[PDB]
Design an enzyme around this catalytic site. Structure first.
Site, PDB file in Angstrom:
ATOM      1  N   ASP A   1       1.711  -7.871   3.871  1.00  0.00           N
ATOM      2  CA  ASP A   1       2.542  -8.644   3.882  1.00  0.00           C
ATOM      3  C   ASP A   1       3.068  -8.636   2.372  1.00  0.00           C
ATOM      4  O   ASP A   1       2.527  -9.211   1.373  1.00  0.00           O
ATOM      5  CB  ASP A   1       2.303 -10.218   3.710  1.00  0.00           C
TER       6      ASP A   1
ATOM      7  N   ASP B   1      10.244  -7.919   2.272  1.00  0.00           N
ATOM      8  CA  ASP B   1       8.974  -8.577   2.956  1.00  0.00           C
ATOM      9  C   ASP B   1       8.648  -8.146   4.235  1.00  0.00           C
ATOM     10  O   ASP B   1       9.418  -8.367   5.219  1.00  0.00           O
ATOM     11  CB  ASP B   1       9.623 -10.038   3.150  1.00  0.00           C
TER      12      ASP B   1
HETATM   13  C1  LIG Z   1       7.740 -15.138   5.408  1.00  0.00           C
HETATM   14  N1  LIG Z   1       6.243 -15.023   5.462  1.00  0.00           N
HETATM   15  C2  LIG Z   1       5.462 -15.904   5.835  1.00  0.00           C
HETATM   16  O1  LIG Z   1       5.824 -16.838   6.589  1.00  0.00           O
HETATM   17  C3  LIG Z   1       4.195 -15.585   5.652  1.00  0.00           C
HETATM   18  C4  LIG Z   1       3.256 -16.538   4.864  1.00  0.00           C
HETATM   19  C5  LIG Z   1       2.126 -16.048   3.755  1.00  0.00           C
HETATM   20  C6  LIG Z   1       1.648 -16.972   3.374  1.00  0.00           C
HETATM   21  S1  LIG Z   1       2.374 -18.464   3.652  1.00  0.00           S
HETATM   22  C7  LIG Z   1       3.337 -17.824   4.792  1.00  0.00           C
HETATM   23  C8  LIG Z   1       3.412 -15.337   7.109  1.00  0.00           C
HETATM   24  C9  LIG Z   1       2.145 -16.129   7.535  1.00  0.00           C
HETATM   25  C10 LIG Z   1       1.729 -15.979   8.642  1.00  0.00           C
HETATM   26  C11 LIG Z   1       2.295 -14.844   9.707  1.00  0.00           C
HETATM   27  C12 LIG Z   1       3.468 -14.205   9.278  1.00  0.00           C
HETATM   28  C13 LIG Z   1       4.212 -13.277  10.066  1.00  0.00           C
HETATM   29  C14 LIG Z   1       4.500 -13.667  11.511  1.00  0.00           C
HETATM   30  C15 LIG Z   1       5.112 -12.514  12.140  1.00  0.00           C
HETATM   31  C16 LIG Z   1       5.370 -11.329  11.582  1.00  0.00           C
HETATM   32  N2  LIG Z   1       5.318 -11.140  10.309  1.00  0.00           N
HETATM   33  C17 LIG Z   1       4.613 -11.932   9.699  1.00  0.00           C
HETATM   34  C18 LIG Z   1       3.994 -14.437   7.964  1.00  0.00           C
HETATM   35  N3  LIG Z   1       4.227 -14.073   5.156  1.00  0.00           N
HETATM   36  C19 LIG Z   1       5.457 -14.152   4.815  1.00  0.00           C
HETATM   37  N4  LIG Z   1       5.996 -12.994   4.164  1.00  0.00           N
END
Ligand SMILES: CN1C(=O)[C@@](c2ccsc2)(c2cccc(-c3cccnc3)c2)N=C1N
Length: 371
Positions: free
Chosen positions: A35, A226
């Protein structure tokens, strides 16, 4: 060597790409979401209905409690846990082990995904957005500090391409640039600021047609790259104009705005998909030279995400532009942290039909676009 990092990522369409890692001693194997849109290494550390495994601190001889909690609310959901450090490696990554901060998630809401097959999250962005604050060194910072791994990584996200969500594969090359993963030239756009991987978009075109907006609108209030967002997400004003132009290019044939709204799938059947009626979309990113830019051009094959059924993978945003996986899947993307820039090149894993290709082309001269 980089050969051993090729194909070191997997995931399911719409559910993120992950890389296998190990944490603690003996090594506990977890799949971790790669991520670029966050900065915490955070891993399930307690039972959850969507987790079939998790990090057990007590089983690690090398765990060290930081005696400090961390709570991470966000729009969609939240996670919370307990900070520590432990030895971490990436089996199909560099052959090193590092002591890194680890947030062991003890509770969480709408964070984990059913069937995603990852157990945690590898925040690859910068300290500035780390939780609880910027003193918690992110993993990549630790890796570079503790080893002689160069301050760079690159992502070749490949998607699925031709009952259950399609699988995706890709490569995360850490500490360098693997020339076999792309063709043509790499073009670089500056990281505007080291928090998110923030960039500047100076122009966008749909089938060659300029949306003719004040470029501030493209980066309102920021534009980021991202891997942890699936969709190309656009600020409201830009989204509307985008979908407008798109609806027009594909006028022949109509869809319910449930589709355009990115919550309703549409299907053709077996290879009848009329890619040709959907337009390409070019994002022009600021060059390393003031008045230059370059464009990355993406095909319907990238913004129609398969679910022959697809969901429209462009969606609206209140937090700026997000160039998520569907944009990155065209390209080999270099997060050159050491030179504060992100390079883009056409990916060896090319999901193109015999009329069009995703492209990275430049320079284009544009004679102020930031927040
Ligand atoms: C947008 N984003 C988020 O919401 C997340 C984040 C990180 C810390 S708190 C929120 C996150 C958390 C959990 C799952 C996902 C996800 C789901 C589906 C596809 N790809 C990623 C993303 N990481 C990013 N960049």
């Amino acid at each position: 060597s980089f050969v051993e990092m090729v194909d070191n990522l997997r995931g399911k369409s719409g559910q993120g790409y992950y890389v296998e890692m190990t944490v603690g001693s003996p090594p506990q194997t977890l799949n971790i979401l790669v991520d670029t849109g966050s900065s915490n290494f955070a891993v399930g550390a307690a039972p959850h209905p969507f987790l079939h495994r998790y990090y057990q601190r007590q089983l690690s001889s090398t765990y060290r409690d930081l005696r400090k909690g961390v709570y991470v609310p966000y729009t969609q959901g939240k996670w919370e846990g307990e900070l520590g450090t432990d030895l971490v490696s990436i089996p199909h990554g560099p052959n090193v082990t590092v002591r890194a901060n680890i947030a062991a998630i003890t509770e969480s809401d709408k964070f984990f995904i059913n069937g995603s097959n990852w157990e945690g999250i590898l925040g690859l962005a910068y300290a500035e957005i780390a939780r609880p604050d910027d003193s918690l060194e992110p993993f990549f910072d630790s890796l570079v500090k503790q080893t002689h791994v160069p301050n760079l990584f690159s992502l070749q996200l490949c998607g699925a391409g031709f009952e259950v969500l399609a699988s995706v594969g890709g490569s995360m090359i850490i500490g360098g640039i693997d020339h076999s993963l792309y063709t043509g030239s790499l073009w670089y756009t500056p990281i505007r600021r080291e928090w998110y991987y923030e960039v500047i978009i100076v122009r966008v075109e749909i089938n060659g047609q300029d949306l003719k907006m004040d470029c501030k609108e493209y980066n309102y209030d920021k534009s980021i790259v991202d891997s942890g967002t699936t969709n190309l997400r656009l600020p409201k004003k830009v989204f509307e104009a985008a979908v407008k132009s798109i609806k027009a290019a594909s006028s022949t044939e109509k869809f319910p705005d449930g589709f355009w709204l990115g919550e309703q799938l549409v299907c053709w059947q077996a290879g009848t998909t009329p890619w040709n009626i959907f337009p390409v979309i070019s994002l022009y990113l600021m060059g390393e030279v003031t008045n230059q830019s370059f464009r990355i051009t993406i095909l319907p094959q990238q913004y129609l995400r398969p679910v022959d059924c697809y969901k429209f993978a462009i969606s609206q945003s209140s937090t700026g532009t997000v160039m998520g996986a569907v944009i990155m899947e065209g390209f080999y993307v270099v997060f050159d942290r050491a030179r504060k820039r992100i390079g883009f090149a056409v990916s060896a894993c090319h999901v193109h039909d015999e009329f069009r290709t995703a492209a990275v082309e430049g320079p284009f001269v544009t004679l102020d676009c930031g927040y």
